[PDB]
Amino acid sequence: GVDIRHNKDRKVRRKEPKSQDIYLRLLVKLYRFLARRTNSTFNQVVLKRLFMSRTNRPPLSLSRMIRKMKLPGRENKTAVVVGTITDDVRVQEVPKLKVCALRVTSRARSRILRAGGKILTFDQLALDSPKGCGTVLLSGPRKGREVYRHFGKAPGTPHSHTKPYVRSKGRKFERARGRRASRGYKN
Amino acid sequence: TNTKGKRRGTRYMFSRPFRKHGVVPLATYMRIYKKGDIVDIKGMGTVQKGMPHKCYHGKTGRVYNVTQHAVGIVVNKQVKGKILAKRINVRIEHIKHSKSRDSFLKRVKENDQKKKEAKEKGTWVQLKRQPAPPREAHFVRTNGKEPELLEPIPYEF
Amino acid sequence: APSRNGMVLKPHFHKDWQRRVATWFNQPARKIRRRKARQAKARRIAPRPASG
Amino acid sequence: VNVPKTRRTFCKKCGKHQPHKVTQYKKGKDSLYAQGKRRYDRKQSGYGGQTKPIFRKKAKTTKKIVLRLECVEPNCRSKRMLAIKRCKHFELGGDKKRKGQVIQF
RNA sequence: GUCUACGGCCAUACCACCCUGAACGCGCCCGAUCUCGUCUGAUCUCGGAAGCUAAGCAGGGUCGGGCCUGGUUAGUACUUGGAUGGGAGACCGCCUGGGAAUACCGGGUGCUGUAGGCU
RNA sequence: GAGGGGCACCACCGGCCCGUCUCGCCCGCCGCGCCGGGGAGGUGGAGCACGAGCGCACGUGUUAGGACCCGAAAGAUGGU
RNA sequence: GACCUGGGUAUAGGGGCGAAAGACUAAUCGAACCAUCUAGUAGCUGGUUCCCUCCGAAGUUUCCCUCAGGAUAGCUGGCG
RNA sequence: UUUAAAUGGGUAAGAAGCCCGGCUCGCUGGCGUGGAGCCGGGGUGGAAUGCGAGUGCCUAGUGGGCCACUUUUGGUAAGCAGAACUGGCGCUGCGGGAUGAACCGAACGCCGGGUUAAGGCGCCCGAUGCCGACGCUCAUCAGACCCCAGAAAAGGUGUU
RNA sequence: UUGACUGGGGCGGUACACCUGUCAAACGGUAACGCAGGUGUCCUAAGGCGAGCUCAGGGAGGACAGAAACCUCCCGUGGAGCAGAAGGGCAAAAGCUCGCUUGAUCUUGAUUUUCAGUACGAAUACAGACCGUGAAAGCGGGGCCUCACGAUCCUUCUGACCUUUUGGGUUUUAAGCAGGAGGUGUCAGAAAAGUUACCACAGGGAUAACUGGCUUGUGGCGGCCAAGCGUUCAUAGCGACGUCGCUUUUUGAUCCUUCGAUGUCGGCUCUUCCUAUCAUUGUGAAGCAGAAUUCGCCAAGCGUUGGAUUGUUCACCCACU
Ligand SMILES: [Mg+2]
Ligand SMILES: [Mg+2]
Ligand SMILES: [Mg+2]
Ligand SMILES: [Mg+2]
Ligand SMILES: [Mg+2]
Ligand SMILES: [Mg+2]
Ligand SMILES: [Mg+2]
Ligand SMILES: [Mg+2]
Ligand SMILES: [Mg+2]
Ligand SMILES: [Zn+2]
C-alpha cells in the first residue's frame, strides 16, 4: 500500500462530444488535429467548446457582439463563438462586422449581410486564420438561464434571494409565514 | 442536558486575575483602532455590556467597523466541519492591539532600508530568513585543567 | 416523504380515476366519420352553400 | 406590581412626550358575525359533533397584563397598547412605598 | 536638589515606627457678612493671612512586614510520543522530547509625561 | 521584457423599478380639491442593468395512483 | 318426573335463543356464513433473478406524540 | 487556590503589500483638524517541506454500531453502564498469536526470481543436525512467550 | 382515545423548555435516572440620572444597659450588601441615604447566542426621533452579567382624515394592512378515561421470567497478625481490632445466546462425578489415665436409612444406626 487518498484522480472533463452529429464530428477532427499540431491556445479553447453541452454553449445576441466589438482595437478582427447568434430586436442599426459561428439564425444572418457583414463557419475560419490570429472569441451569458436563479443557499435562509419552486405565482402561494414579520417571522 | 446558556464555562476567564481588581486603567480607553487593525479578544469581567462570547476569548480578528464605544471584528470561528468568518461587535475594553504582525512590520521596515542599502553598494545580502542551521565546526578549549569525572550516585531513601 | 428542493405538488389522483379514463383511440375514426357526415350533407343540400 | 395612574410617554399622533391616562385593557365582547365565527357556526351546525379543538391542557397561572395609554390633551385622544411582563397581583394606583417604616411584619 | 496643577504605568509606589525638611508652594490655620450646606461653619460653601512645621506632604532610616526580581528546591514532580518492557495486580523503570511549584537563601524598593515655580 | 483591448464568471462600489418609512420643498390643470405629479435619505421584493426560451426525446430523483412482490387483527354493504 | 323422543311450526347476526357456561346458532361464536367495497392498511417480518471495470459509506448534528420511523446537516457517487 | 507545566487553540510570515502627491465629503471639527473614499505615480528575491487548484448542480445509502491503548464518570465488580482523543472492526483477505471479529505484522490485479516484517527453528511442522556464550533452577501440583484465558497476603537453616 | 424517557414494563421520578458550579481531560465542544442546587416569579422602584456617604466584623470608652438597645473614637481589600440558585463582578462603587424623573416610550436594518448556522427567547453595537437627569462631560431605550418564557388558524384592542366591499354612488357592517394581547409546561405547539384470565394480529431475543456466561457485593468455606480466653499458660482447643483470598451448591447485579417455542417446581426411578471426610482403613496432636470426645493428615474405596405433618425445596419431630 502507498497512500491514504480519497481517489479523485479521474478528471471529469469531456474528451469527445456526446452528440452524434456527423457534421460536428468533422469539426472536432479538424480542430483536434489543429490543437495538437499548431502550438496555439486558440485551437485549444475552440476545441474544448466544441465538446461542451448545449447548456454550456449559450446563445449570443447580436447586440452583445456589437457591444463587445466596438471596444478600442476590435475594428477589423473576427467574431468567434462556438454557439448560436440570435438577433436583438432592440438594436436599430448593425455594423459591417465579420463573424464566425456554429449556426447563425435566419433573421440574424439576414441583418448582418444587409449591413455588409460576412458569416463564416469553422472550416473557412481555419483556412483564413489557422492559428486564430486576428480573432475576438466571445461567449454568451452562461448564467443567463432561469435555472441559475433557483440556485443558491435556500429560500428560507436569511439574505438568500433564491426564488422557490412554486406552481403558480400569486397571493396565497408561499407568502405567509417565514416571509413577513406579522405571520410568525421573516427569515 | 448541558445548559446551553451564555456565560457558562467562565468561572475563571471572565474574572480579573488576582490583585488587579477595581476600576480599569485609562490607557485602555485611549487606544486607537482603525479599519483593518488586527486585534485580539479577551473579555474582562468588570465591564458587563460588550463581552463577546466565550467562543472568541483568546482569538484574533480584524476591524471592519469602528463605533463610539465598540469595534466590529471579523474572527474565524470553528463550527463542526468548516470555519466561518463571523463578525462580532465587542466593546473597547475587551480587546487590545495584537503584536502578532508587529514582528513583520519591523522587518518590512528594516528590509526595504537594507534592500536599497546594498543596491547602492552592489552586494548579495540575502535578506530572506533561514531557520536555525546546524552548528559550525568550532574548536573547544580545555586549557590547563582536565574534564571532571562524574559518576552516578548510590541510592538512598 | 419529500426530499430536497422541489415543488410542493397536489396531484388529484386520490379518487377512483381508473374507471373514468378516456382514451382517444377512436379520434381518427371519428374524424373520418364526421367528414363523411359533412360530405353526405353537402350533396343533400346540393346547390345550397355548405356551412349553412 | 404597581404602576402609576398617569404617565408622560410618547404619542404617535404628534411625536411628543405628553401625559397619558393609563387604565387596564379588558378583552371585549366576542362579536358575532366575524369571519371565523361565521365559519365556526356553519361548520359546527348539523351532525358531526364538535368540529374544532377545545384546549384543555392549561399550564400557565398569570397573564401578560397590558396597559392602554390615552393621550390626555384634547382633540388628540390617541390610544395605544403598552405591555408589562407578567404578574400575579397588579395594583394600578395605590401605595407608593417609603423606606422609613416601622414595618414589623 | 526638589515641588505645585494635571497625568500615564498602578505596591520596587503599600503598611508600622523613628529622624530631617532651606526657598517657593502645598497645607494646617483665623473668621460667618454674603453664596451655600448643617442637629453642630466639624464636613461642605464662602471672607482671610494673626500664627505653624506639630501633623499631613516630601526625603532618609529599620539584620522591618509585604511587594518586585533571582538562585536553590531540580532536570525533582508532572507530561508528548514508543515498546510482544517488568509486575498477580496497584503501579513502575527505560526510550524520545518538553519541564514546574513552596520552604530556604540573595539583591532592589518607585519610574516617567505636560505645564508652571523655587534653589 | 513590457504595454494595450478585455469574453464568460466571481467579489465589491454606484444607479434603476415596486412596496413602506423619515425629511422636505416645488410643479401641472377636462377645472383649483379632505386634487394630480416630482424630490432627498434608509429599508422590504422570488426584480432591471442589451433577451433565452419553447417544443421533442432520453436518463436520474421524488410524489399521487394496487405502485417492487407477498402478509394482517379489522371496518362497511347486501344476502343465505 | 322441572322425564325421554319423532315429525310439524316459530324466532336470524350487534340479531336470535339461553334453569346463565359469554353457552348455543350446520365440525365456525367475547359477534356466524357467502359475495362485494378489495390488490383495504402496516414506521413491521420474508424475498427481490447476468457479467466485468472504476469510485466508495454511515451508525453522528438539529427538529418531530420523536425512541424499530422520518425530515435536516455531515459522509458518497455521478455530471461538469 | 497565590503559583503553575507538558499537550493544545487563534493570528502574522507581502504587490489585495509599502511609499509619495492630489481631489471628494452633507461625517468629524480651534486648525488646510480627524478619518473614510477616489485618482495618478514609484520600486517585487521576502520561513522550512510538500502538493496542481477553484467552483457549481444533481444525488443514493446511512440515522441499532462495536473494540483496543491513553484519559475519565456511575459501580464491590462485570465479556457492565456512560463519555474524550486516535486507530481499527463493521466493509478486510493475508503472515503470526495452536484455536479466534477487534491482538501483532502487513493491507490484496495475474505470476516467476529475490529479500524480509511479526513470529519462530527437538518432532508433528519450513528452519539451530550452531562442537553457540554466562548463570539460575528439582517440583510426591515443575516451568514454558503482548492481548490471554488462573492467584494473594504470610512463610522456608530449599538453594543462589 | 388511553403520552414520552426508562439498566424489561409498571409504580416512582422528570434527566420532557430552561439557568448556576462540577464532571470536562488548562481554547471551544462533550454522555449517563452523574453530583450540588435553582426556575414558571418579584420590582413605579428593586427602572433612569446626579449628589453625599461606607460595609461585615473587632477593639476601647459612655446613666439604667446585660452576648445583643443607642452614642463616640480607632482599625477595617470587601470577611457586607447587590429581590431571590450559584458563579463572576463592584468601594468618593454596581452597596446606603436623598433630590428629580419615566429611555420599562417611537422606528428601520445589522450582529451575537442555540443553531441546520432556521425560528422563538435573551442580548450586543448602531442609526433617525421625541425625552429624562446632571454644572457639564455624559449616561439612559428595563433590573450589575449569566435564566425567568410561546408558531399557523381564530379572537380582541389600537393605528392612518388608508385599501377593498364585485354595474355606479352614500351609510352601517364585514374583509384587509401594521403590532399588542387571549395559549399550547408533552414548553418547534392533538382535542382525549379504563379493563381484559374470553382475548386477536404484526413483530421483537433491540426487551423481561429458565439454564449457560462475565462479576462475587451477598451467602459459603478458608488463611495471615495476636489484645485476649483457656487455674497458671497468646497459639491443646479458640480468638477480638484488623487484613489477604478462594468457591459458584446462596441471592443479586448485568443483558451476551434463545420470542417462525430449548416443555417451566417438587417427588419417584436410575447412573456417574466432585471433596471442602459424617462414618469405615492407616496415622500424628490434646487441657489424650482408661472409656468417650476434640483438632489435623494420606484418602472419595465403601456406606450415608425407616417414618409422621407439609405440593414442598427447606424445615421439624419419632425411631433405628
Ligand atoms: Mg447661618
Ligand atoms: Mg441657609
Ligand atoms: Mg472652621
Ligand atoms: Mg510638616
Ligand atoms: Mg517632625
Ligand atoms: Mg522610610
Ligand atoms: Mg523587608
Ligand atoms: Mg509518554
Ligand atoms: Mg503498536
Ligand atoms: Zn397624542
Side-chain angles (χ1 to χ4, degrees), chain A residues 92-162:
Chain A
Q92 304 299 323
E93 68 177 1
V94 178
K96 60 179 296 296
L97 80 169
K98 180 183 285 186
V99 304
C100 182
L102 275 68
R103 191 184 170 271
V104 184
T105 66
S106 294
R107 290 178 68 191
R109 75 171 68 201
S110 69
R111 296 181 71 246
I112 299 168
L113 298 178
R114 288 187 294 110
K118 178 175 172 61
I119 53 97
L120 279 76
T121 63
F122 281 181
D123 310 334
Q124 49 190 352
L125 176 62
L127 289 176
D128 183 71
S129 64
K131 297 283 189 180
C133 54
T135 60
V136 178
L137 84 95
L138 292 166
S139 179
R142 66 171 63 242
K143 285 196 185 292
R145 297 174 68 239
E146 189 174 358
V147 187
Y148 285 94
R149 65 182 68 251
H150 295 289
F151 292 159
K153 298 180 99 287
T157 293
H159 297 283
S160 62
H161 304 88
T162 316

Side-chain angles (χ1 to χ4, degrees), chain C residues 6-26:
Chain C
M7 201 76 76
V8 47
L9 292 168
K10 304 288 189 183
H12 284 86
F13 283 144
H14 297 275
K15 201 177 291 187
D16 193 4
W17 61 272
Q18 288 176 353
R19 296 179 70 185
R20 286 88 38 76
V21 68
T23 63
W24 288 25
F25 285 140
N26 57 1

Side-chain angles (χ1 to χ4, degrees), chain D residues 8-19:
Chain D
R8 183 173 294 172
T9 328
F10 191 79
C11 62
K12 297 188 290 292
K13 192 263 183 180
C14 70
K16 289 173 96 289
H17 286 186
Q18 61 193 2

Side-chain angles (χ1 to χ4, degrees), chain B residues 2-58:
Chain B
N2 200 5
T3 69
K4 303 292 191 294
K6 299 186 261 78
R7 181 182 266 183
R8 173 258 173 103
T10 70
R11 188 178 185 180
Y12 301 104
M13 58 188 280
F14 289 165
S15 177
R16 299 298 302 273
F18 169 67
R19 205 177 69 195
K20 275 90 179 67
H21 292 280
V23 63
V24 299
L26 270 299
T28 304
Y29 291 104
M30 301 183 285
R31 299 289 176 181
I32 304 306
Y33 300 96
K34 296 174 74 176
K35 288 178 67 176
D37 286 333
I38 303 171
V39 299
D40 45 353
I41 298 173
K42 182 181 176 181
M44 294 198 298
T46 60
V47 286
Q48 305 296 106
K49 302 288 286 186
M51 57 188 66
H53 196 258
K54 60 187 177 294
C55 297
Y56 309 105
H57 176 86

Side-chain angles (χ1 to χ4, degrees), chain B residues 57-102:
Chain B
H57 176 86
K59 294 184 176 65
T60 300
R62 188 185 54 83
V63 180
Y64 76 101
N65 193 5
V66 180
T67 323
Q68 286 90 16
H69 299 285
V71 154
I73 302 165
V74 45
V75 287
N76 291 322
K77 198 179 85 170
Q78 182 72 39
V79 74
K80 286 185 284 293
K82 58 182 178 294
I83 81 163
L84 285 169
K86 293 192 69 62
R87 51 195 64 246
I88 177 65
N89 298 116
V90 179
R91 285 181 73 93
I92 214 69
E93 305 88 0
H94 305 287
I95 65 171
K96 65 181 175 65
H97 285 89
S98 179
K99 281 81 177 174
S100 62
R101 202 183 176 184
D102 291 334

Side-chain angles (χ1 to χ4, degrees), chain A residues 61 63-64 67 87-88 90 139 144 146 161 179 186:
Chain A
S61 66
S63 68
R64 297 182 78 91
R67 189 172 67 184
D87 58 350
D88 272 356
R90 283 91 58 88
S139 179
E146 189 174 358
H161 304 88
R179 298 293 302 277
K186 188 182 286 186

